[PDB]
Amino acid sequence: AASGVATNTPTANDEEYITPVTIGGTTLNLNFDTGSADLWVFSTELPASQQSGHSVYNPSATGKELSGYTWSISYGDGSSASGNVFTDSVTVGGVTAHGQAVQAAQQISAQFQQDTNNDGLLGLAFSSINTVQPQSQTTFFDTVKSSLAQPLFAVALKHQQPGVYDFGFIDSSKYTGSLTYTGVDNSQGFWSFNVDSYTAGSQSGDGFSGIADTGTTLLLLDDSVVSQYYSQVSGAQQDSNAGGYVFDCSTNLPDFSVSISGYTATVPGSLINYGPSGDGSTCLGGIQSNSGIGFSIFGDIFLKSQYVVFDSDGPQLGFAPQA
Ligand SMILES: COC(=O)[C@H](Cc1ccccc1)OP(=O)(O)[C@H](CC(C)C)NC(=O)[C@@H](NC(=O)[C@@H](NC(=O)CC(C)C)C(C)C)C(C)C
Ligand SMILES: *[C@H]1O[C@H](CO)[C@@H](O)[C@H](O)[C@@H]1O
Ligand SMILES: *[C@@H]1OC[C@H](O)[C@@H](O)[C@@H]1O
């Protein structure tokens, strides 16, 4: 039975986490994203000036083309990419998927053109939302799932230190105490779960739903929750140059917690100080608006405080504080 560990590393300010993936013999640094189901890479089909600063996949060397298939995706921050599809061998932390669909980029929006921290994305949401036309394809995880010791993966994202993606096993040394599980609703293809209530510093409120999303840097919440949080942060203000609420870097921020099936998951106020806003001398908050989309996005700010188990049996998610 297979299992493996892939080590991830945060980029500056923990903006994204990248892990090496070997595709047909070339290793690329990909952003593992539990919020989407497409494995796409910078390729030799892009314009040569866009290939610059990246490790690229050359499909003609090892790939088997799926003639006539395309993919096209749009993410939450407006970025997008599209291209064609090949099958190849994809290895992550020593686990190999043979004949994995590899989505070679033909076009990428400006956001990706300017991000040289990754060479593409490895989706880990449910395969039901993979964008490949005319027949959708399975994610790396769905491809190898039946070969792993247990059909699950687990993640520890850390603040300015390397972390891990555990495939097919749970590493009990990565969290304190025991895991608490909650059911997942995969009807929209996401790892969606319910929280029963939340506490933002001195204020507590009713529960809501959200997705466990490794691909989003911040903790995005309903505007009512964000207002409630920052009303407790002296001098907090929104700054469109920074991307949301900012405050003095020395501020004492309140903790934020959510109650999930009996377990309190706490994000300490020191993790809510994302870093320099890059707008003078303020810091950007780790909690920001979800822009009225109707569900919360439990991104990296939240994951940096937990060890999370993504279990295809249920499916369900398990949580425990990171050791
Ligand atoms: C279609 O599904 C997606 O787009 C999913 C789920 C989703 C749906 C709707 C709203 C938000 C989130 O996002 P995702 O795949 O994680 C997607 C992946 C990314 C690498 C383009 N993240 C996003 O689009 C989020 N973008 C981010 O978090 C960007 N981060 C920053 O701009 C750093 C700033 C915030 C300091 C990326 C550069 C990392 C936005 C939600 C804020
Ligand atoms: C993950 O689990 C497998 C299955 O037991 C081991 O063979 C592998 O070395 C790693 O511990
Ligand atoms: C990344 O690869 C495997 C090991 O678990 C990890 O410690 C290393 O940094």
Curated annotation (Swiss-Prot):
Glycans are attached at residues 3, 7. Its EC number is 3.4.23.20. It comes from the Eukaryota. GO terms for biological process: proteolysis. InterPro entries: Aspartic_peptidase_A1, Aspartic_peptidase_AS, Aspergillopepsin-like_cat_dom, PEPTIDASE_A1, Peptidase_aspartic_dom_sf. Residues 17-320 form the Peptidase A1 domain. It is found in: Secreted. One of its GO terms (cellular component) is extracellular region. CDD domains: Aspergillopepsin_like (cd06097). The active site is at residues 33, 213. Secreted aspartic endopeptidase that allows assimilation of proteinaceous substrates. The scissile peptide bond is attacked by a nucleophilic water molecule activated by two aspartic residues in the active site. Shows a broad primary substrate specificity. Favors hydrophobic residues at the P1 and P1' positions, but can also activate trypsinogen and hydrolyze the B chain of insulin between positions 'Gly-20' and 'Glu-21'. Monomer. Belongs to the peptidase A1 family. This is Penicillopepsin-1. It comes from Penicillium janthinellum.
